[PDB]
Amino acid sequence: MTAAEHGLHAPAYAWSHNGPFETFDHASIRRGYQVYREVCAACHSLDRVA
């Protein structure tokens, strides 16, 4: 299938939660909420999160 149809393969960024011993970075989580609320939340629902 043409490379374009598949879509470019996303590289692997070194996430701080990747790792059998790593937890999510909650501070980063908090920031992300704000980003969602002020930028994404105008078009994206988050129906499953109470």
Binding site: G7, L8, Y13, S28, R31, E38, S45
Partner: protein
Amino acid sequence: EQAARAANQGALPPDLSLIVKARHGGCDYIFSLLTGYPDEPPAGVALPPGSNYNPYFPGGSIAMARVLFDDMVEYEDGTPATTSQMAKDVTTFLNWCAE
């Protein structure tokens, strides 16, 4: 759904609750997508009106346009809200939301 499809030129914004798990690459794909928006589609790409070119999206034609730009948010904790810094942060929140 109709109201939603109306406000986005026929397209329908998926609920982000499980998007990290509902895609291949997860955190990586989500992030590379939010950032992956070139300013001009590669030469020869006939792009449908109302569409935007993103290479990481299958088929190249995604209905969502670039929305993340530098400093468009004032992080309460001080952190410089660069476009890739914001991308990293939602994706981590979206990952939590899903898992």
